[PDB]
RNA sequence: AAUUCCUUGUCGGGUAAGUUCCGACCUGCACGAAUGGCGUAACGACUUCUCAACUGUCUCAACCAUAGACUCGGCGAAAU
RNA sequence: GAGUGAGAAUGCAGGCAUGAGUAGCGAUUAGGCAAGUGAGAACCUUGCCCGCCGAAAGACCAAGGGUUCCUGGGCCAGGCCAGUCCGCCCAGGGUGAGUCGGGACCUAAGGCGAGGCCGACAGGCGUAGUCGAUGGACAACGGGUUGAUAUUCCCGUACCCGUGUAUGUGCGUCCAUGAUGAAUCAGCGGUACUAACCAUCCAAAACCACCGUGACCGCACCUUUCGGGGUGUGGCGUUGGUGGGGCUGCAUGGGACCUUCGUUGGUAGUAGUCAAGCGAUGGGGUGACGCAGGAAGGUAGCCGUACCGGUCAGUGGUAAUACCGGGGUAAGCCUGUAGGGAGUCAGAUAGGUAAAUCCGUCUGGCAUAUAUCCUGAGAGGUGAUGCAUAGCCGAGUGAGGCGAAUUCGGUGAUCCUAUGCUGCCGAGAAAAGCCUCUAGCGAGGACAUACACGGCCCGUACCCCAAACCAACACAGGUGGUCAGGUAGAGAAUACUAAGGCGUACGAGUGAACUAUGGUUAAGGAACUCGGCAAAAUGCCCCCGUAACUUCGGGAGAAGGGGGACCCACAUGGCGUGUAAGCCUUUACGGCCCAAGCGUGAGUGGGUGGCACAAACCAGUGAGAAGCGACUGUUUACUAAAAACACAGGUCCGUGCGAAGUCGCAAGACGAUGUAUACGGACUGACGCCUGCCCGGUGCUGGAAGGUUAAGAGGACCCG
RNA sequence: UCUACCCAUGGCCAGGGUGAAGCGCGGGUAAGACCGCGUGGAGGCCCGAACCCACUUAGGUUGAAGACUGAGGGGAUGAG
RNA sequence: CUGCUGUGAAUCUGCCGGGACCACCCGGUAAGCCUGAAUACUUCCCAGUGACCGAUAGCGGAUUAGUACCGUGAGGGAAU
């Protein structure tokens, strides 16, 4: 009777693993960000 | 000693335990012990370098004077005999006459009140430490140096233990326990007698779970693998690998050992393989 | 024989009737000694054979209630 | 000059048909009536019933959500129907902290990481550090109040950090007072790191003798006389191997010439130092840790009761004799019980980065102390002339006012003492905090009293086993923690119930077939079927009694047989508890014993009722063989749980140590704070008896006289 | 953030059986062995809820659900 | 012409090049450095133009447009 789905909410660990200092820190999540907000999108990173 | 369990449960049925008869105390010394936790045999990135390494239970550090190189002349009794979960052999908890404590691997038939005296007018009373330059040729000693000053790294494990051959020059020729002679240099430090908990080693532990209580995880083989996971998996059925036997990236078995190795001219001779 | 094609091999047991089963025989298509061989008490939601008890599994089906089906009002799809 | 012509691309978009007014309208609880509201009511409001949950379908949270909460209004969309209602729409309102949960405190796994090392660059790791709770430290409880918050507001009583002021004891810098340990002059005795010196381990360059040649030959010489070859001694000569000699040469340890450390006649406790207080970022102790298993002492809770307040429930009896309801109250501050733990005093002393009077260590004197100290459930007092409560009232929309008794027991924890105690091996975080010592800072400072103050930032509404979170839905699925009434009962199972909460969102009918889910079934009893699939059956407690086989543990609840209800008596019995009465003593928060009071099985004999006495619900079918795997375990999320994997045991191989192996370009890491009784790899797979032959092939390991072979050295000879 | 394995730090596991070593007593033994009795509380022990699984079957199979439900089923102090 | 490695001279009757190489002729003067113009492009601003589209077209976006929404996330992405 498993019926577990795969998303569980988590505000920390969100912020943690896709968040904008996370982004920051290594080079391609400069990129990303950068990438984003040439597109235009309202909200770059979680 | 050992003990043997009654056979009243199929997970008992041959399974033995240890009598601990020379632990003297069952708790440690205080300011002697580190925090020790588990690396599930991953190294820096995470990854499984050595498998079958995880569960177990807890277990914390005794600090052992490897290096018994700055208590010289000064005597120490022995305090307790007591139990180490990171060794086979037992420690013994040393009270230097200054007022020091310090833990050693304690040697065969050691106890309590013993004085141990470290320095090279120490006598050969089993537990004295010294260097090799000043025990007689023909003594058995355990814990010694490789390289004048590094501390004990030979013949520590329980039960074990080093034949002083001989000296020559600055070399003493000495026999590991593997059967091998090498040659070390003189001026290294070791201690005079035979590792205790000899008996350790004739111990069924009985069931899986007695050994995944020692941070041992399962060993699965490779003829019951796939092709993609191990040399030896594939086929329909059993199969004796279907090939030269190898390990899990395909090496095959055979010497081992980095060739012209700097310490390949101190050995003398080689170990044994099964005659 | 978790292995035997030939094969439902042969003999006994078991059934009223035995191609499975059990005990043996050896003509081992094409067992065999750590890809272990032969036994083995305990264990098994394992595979197989049997007895007792028990029964709608069956001879052979009947009846009762509830949810649907069915009728009335409301809303109201679908693959095709 | 073309984006120039569609009917097909299981073509793309939008609008609309067919099925069709058809299926469905989302559990296993269930609704009814009277009244009200309103245009309209099965569904909304109110009352009275009935039913369901009740280890929840009740109460409170975390995570997550985000305004869903309250009030007023609404009824177009949403709600699987309607809707006056709504978790929906609209507007306004609502979340109050020194003590709760976090930060301002501390660290773990880990993350990042000044310099750093590594790497063509991009980058990889990482030191010091600094973050990082799921853990450690740290001060508040009961009642009341709003439509909506409540250890937050208020009331009562507390506790913890700072701060200022006034007063009190009162050590003190100055005086002065003690304690004081010295040194120099010079007389000295060893203790000295300092030659030269001695013993020890090893061989500097080295001979002798026994025994052989790595190849040549002179050989005892042998074999078809000599084909090949070769057992064996010798010289040229050593792959040379072995046992001998002391000076000798190196290093290791030792006293001693050398210095220094201690001793004193007089001058000179002169001069200096300690004796208030705060004291580390340093030293130390503690913090500080596992699992299982009781027993004992408690309290909560529950069940009765003295006492209190009341009822007459339109029935045959029942007026107090019966029935119903009360039979309450925290932290804190006192006291220090049951339990549990603990020697004390002095001297010397680098071992603790320096110093320690602290800690360790070694010595010594005392009595095992009902002493003393610490801790510690609970009882008791106080908190509390307060607060709360069964009720009683005028008197209604209900705001309000008054308010009795509270005593003894029984039972009893999964909660507390308890971070205890006892066993066991698998041998069980850190840091701050606190205490302590000196380094040091120091002329003031310590404890107390009274008054007046400062106590920061974030969350706090509401849901939270759910129509408010994860599931596209108001979805039969999923979701961590706390609390745990009664009666049967071993029980947190099950049946029924209390408090509390629901009746959850389509209905009303109707004896069709058929499907699903339950029930019963004459006679037979596996005749069914691939197969006893599915159902049926056994099922509990207590006595009696139990097989082959066994590894001596088991098999075993083997198998099998008898009893079980209610009343009475034995019985004012026995047992637990325990008041009085009494006994005993360190005299008390004592122990012993026990009438009473309460609670409570077991049998024994007699009787009684029924078809039936473990009456419901709950709750093993048993026996005999064979194959495989020994065993408990693991596994193809979503058709395979198995004999397959694992396993404890066995062997083989590698590894002498920043090992081997593995992750990396490297540095570095794991292996392992391990060291051959250890670690990695391979096969086998408890146990018992054993494991034959083949080394030709292919690998592995080892060896070298030859054959063959790269780059590199060579450049004769030839050509321009 | 599902899942596989590991690392740190926490929590949970109703109720009831069995009765290991160890200790103590006696018997027996030149002395043992051993037995009978007790205390004792072991165990990848037993029965069995919470919890975790997922063996059988029936239903579902334009579902209530893109893997559930009902009735039984295995583990349940541990490799949990 | 040029990188890594090894070897490694001459200062002008030198040294380099002229498609292996040599001789002769010719051209030049390495191992030092600066340098405008003519050439490439358009985030942005100004002004224009189109045998360009005209709301399923033209930008994904004439309107809430990188919006709503879908995804853990990189990202995908409307309709009016
Ligand atoms: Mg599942
Ligand atoms: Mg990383
Ligand atoms: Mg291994
Ligand atoms: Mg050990
Ligand atoms: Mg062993
Ligand atoms: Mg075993
Ligand atoms: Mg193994
Ligand atoms: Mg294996
Ligand atoms: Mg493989
Ligand atoms: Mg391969
Ligand atoms: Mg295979
Ligand atoms: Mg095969
Ligand atoms: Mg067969
Ligand atoms: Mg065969
Ligand atoms: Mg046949
Ligand atoms: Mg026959
Ligand atoms: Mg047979
Ligand atoms: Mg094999
Ligand atoms: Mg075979
Ligand atoms: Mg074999
Ligand atoms: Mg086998
Ligand atoms: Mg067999
Ligand atoms: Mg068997
Ligand atoms: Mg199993
Ligand atoms: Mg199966
Ligand atoms: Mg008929
Ligand atoms: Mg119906
Ligand atoms: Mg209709
Ligand atoms: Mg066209
Ligand atoms: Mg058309
Ligand atoms: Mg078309
Ligand atoms: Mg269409
Ligand atoms: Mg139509
Ligand atoms: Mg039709
Ligand atoms: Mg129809
Ligand atoms: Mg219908
Ligand atoms: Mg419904
Ligand atoms: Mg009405
Ligand atoms: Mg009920
Ligand atoms: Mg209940
Ligand atoms: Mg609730
Ligand atoms: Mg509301
Ligand atoms: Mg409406
Ligand atoms: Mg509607
Ligand atoms: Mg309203
Ligand atoms: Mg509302
Ligand atoms: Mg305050
Ligand atoms: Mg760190
Ligand atoms: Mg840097
Ligand atoms: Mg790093
Ligand atoms: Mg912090
Ligand atoms: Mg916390
Ligand atoms: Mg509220
Ligand atoms: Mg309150
Ligand atoms: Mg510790
Ligand atoms: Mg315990
Ligand atoms: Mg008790
Ligand atoms: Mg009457
Ligand atoms: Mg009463
Ligand atoms: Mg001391
Ligand atoms: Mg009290
Ligand atoms: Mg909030
Ligand atoms: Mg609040
Ligand atoms: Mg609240
Ligand atoms: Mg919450
Ligand atoms: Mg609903
Ligand atoms: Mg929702
Ligand atoms: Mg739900
Ligand atoms: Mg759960
Ligand atoms: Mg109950
Ligand atoms: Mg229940
Ligand atoms: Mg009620
Ligand atoms: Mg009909
Ligand atoms: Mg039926
Ligand atoms: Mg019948
Ligand atoms: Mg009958
Ligand atoms: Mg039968
Ligand atoms: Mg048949
Ligand atoms: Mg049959
Ligand atoms: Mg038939
Ligand atoms: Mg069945
Ligand atoms: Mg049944
Ligand atoms: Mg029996
Ligand atoms: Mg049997
Ligand atoms: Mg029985
Ligand atoms: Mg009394
Ligand atoms: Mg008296
Ligand atoms: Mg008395
Ligand atoms: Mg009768
Ligand atoms: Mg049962
Ligand atoms: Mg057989
Ligand atoms: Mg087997
Ligand atoms: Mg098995
Ligand atoms: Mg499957
Ligand atoms: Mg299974
Ligand atoms: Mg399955
Ligand atoms: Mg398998
Ligand atoms: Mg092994
Ligand atoms: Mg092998
Ligand atoms: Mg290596
Ligand atoms: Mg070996
Ligand atoms: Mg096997
Ligand atoms: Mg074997
Ligand atoms: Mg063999
Ligand atoms: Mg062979
Ligand atoms: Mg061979
Ligand atoms: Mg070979
Ligand atoms: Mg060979
Ligand atoms: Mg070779
Ligand atoms: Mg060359
Ligand atoms: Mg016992
Ligand atoms: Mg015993
Ligand atoms: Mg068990
Ligand atoms: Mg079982
Ligand atoms: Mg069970
Ligand atoms: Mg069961
Ligand atoms: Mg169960
Ligand atoms: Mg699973
Ligand atoms: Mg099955
Ligand atoms: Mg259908
Ligand atoms: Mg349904
Ligand atoms: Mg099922
Ligand atoms: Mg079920
Ligand atoms: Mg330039
Ligand atoms: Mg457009
Ligand atoms: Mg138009
Ligand atoms: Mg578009
Ligand atoms: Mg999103």
Not at chain 2, 91 to 120: C, F, M, N, T, W
Not at chain 2, 185 to 210: L, M, P
Not at chain 2, 234 to 239: A, C, I, P
């Amino acid at each position: 009777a498993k019926g577990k789905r795969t998303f569980q909410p988590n505000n920390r660990r969100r912020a943690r693993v896709h968040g904008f200092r996370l982004r920051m820190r290594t080079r391609a999540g400069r990129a990303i960000v950068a990438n984003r907000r040439s597109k235009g999108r309202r909200a770059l990173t979680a | 000693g050992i003990r043997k369990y009654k056979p009243t449960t199929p997970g008992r049925r041959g399974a033995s335990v240890s009598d601990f008869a020379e632990i003297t105390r069952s708790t440690p010394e205080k300011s002697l012990v580190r925090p020790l936790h588990g690396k599930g045999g991953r190294n820096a990135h995470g990854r499984i370098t050595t498998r079958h390494k995880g569960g177990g239970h807890k277990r914390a550090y005794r600090v052992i004077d490897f290096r018994r190189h700055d208590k010289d002349g000064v005597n120490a009794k022995v305090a307790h005999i007591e139990y180490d979960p990171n060794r086979t052999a037992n420690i013994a908890l040393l009270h230097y006459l200054d007022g020091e404590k310090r833990y050693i691997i304690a040697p065969q038939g050691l106890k309590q009140g013993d004085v141990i005296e470290s320095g090279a007018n120490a006598d050969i009373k089993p537990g004295n430490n010294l260097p090799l330059r000043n025990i007689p040729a023909g003594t058995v000693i355990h814990a010694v140096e490789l390289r004048p000053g590094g501390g004990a790294k030979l013949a520590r494990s329980a039960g074990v233990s080093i034949q002083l051959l001989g000296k020559e020059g600055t070399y003493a020729a000495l026999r590991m326990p593997s059967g091998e002679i090498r040659r070390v240099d003189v001026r290294c430090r070791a201690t005079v007698g035979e590792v205790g908990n000899a008996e350790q080693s004739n111990i069924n532990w009985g069931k899986a779970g007695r050994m995944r209580w020692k941070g041992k995880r399962p060993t699965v083989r490779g003829v019951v693998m796939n092709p993609v996971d191990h040399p030896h998996g594939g086929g329909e059925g059993k199969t004796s690998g279907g090939r030269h036997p190898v390990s899990p990236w395909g090496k095959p078995e055979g010497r081992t050992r980095k060739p012209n190795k700097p310490s390949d001219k101190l050995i003398v001779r080689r170990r044994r393989t099964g005659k």
